[PDB]
Amino acid sequence: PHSMRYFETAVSRPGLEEPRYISVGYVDNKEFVRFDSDAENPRYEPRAPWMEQEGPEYWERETQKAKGQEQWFRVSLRNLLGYYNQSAGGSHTLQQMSGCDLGSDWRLLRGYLQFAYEGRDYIALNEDLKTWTAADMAAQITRRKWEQSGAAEHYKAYLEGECVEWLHRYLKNGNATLLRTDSPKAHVTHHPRSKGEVTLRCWALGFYPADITLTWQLNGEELTQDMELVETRPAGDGTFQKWASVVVPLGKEQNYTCRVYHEGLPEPLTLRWEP
């Protein structure tokens, strides 16, 4: 599978008529471009090296699009104040996710378009790219407006055409970075917990991409319930970290084993506490 996404946010500012607008593009979940209206010169910037392959026209055309997006979010934000009878002053947020998924057959699996107001679902284009799902009463106003105007045809055309085309291009252009892995470096630590009981923590560090599985085992059986699993976190260098711990009887640590699964591992790792 492969994917492209643009995640946009406009934030209403107390005392200012222009919203803060930020747009981030991802290919396969990796940021590749970025626009921020607060920057000194507001323009789209490469965020992955394989994007330097684009000439000045690209960044010019992308930047122009963003100034159009700025105004669209500004007006829409103003409209939402009416729909919810919201006071002047205040800060409010409007967000947009759009893009496409490609299948194993590199064909368009699905297109996406969603909006949220105040961090909550507002309206979404359904998988058919014809209908709209409104989450509440105010979004029904927007749904009905957009049915009456043929909004969906415009978005549909972007999602099946331009999105797909450039995704193929980026996948070709950034192939050697995007399709790489970094397999985890893994070890087990041992810590005090309580009277006659210890924690065994299984670390996996420096890995890419983010998807990974850590499991613990005693006597041949999984410990799904009984294990603590942190949320996967960026190391700061493009790689990620995760760990999984279990609370264990003191003296019975060797009976416990940890397994790590990752795309960069042909055969999964088996780890054990080593005194």
């Binding site: 789209y44 699009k65 007006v75 947009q96």
Partner: peptide, 10 residues
């Protein structure tokens, strides 16, 4: 390549 929104607002 980013999307330009349809000219109908929310």
């Amino acid at each position: 390549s980013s999307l330009e929104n349809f000219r109908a607002y929310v």
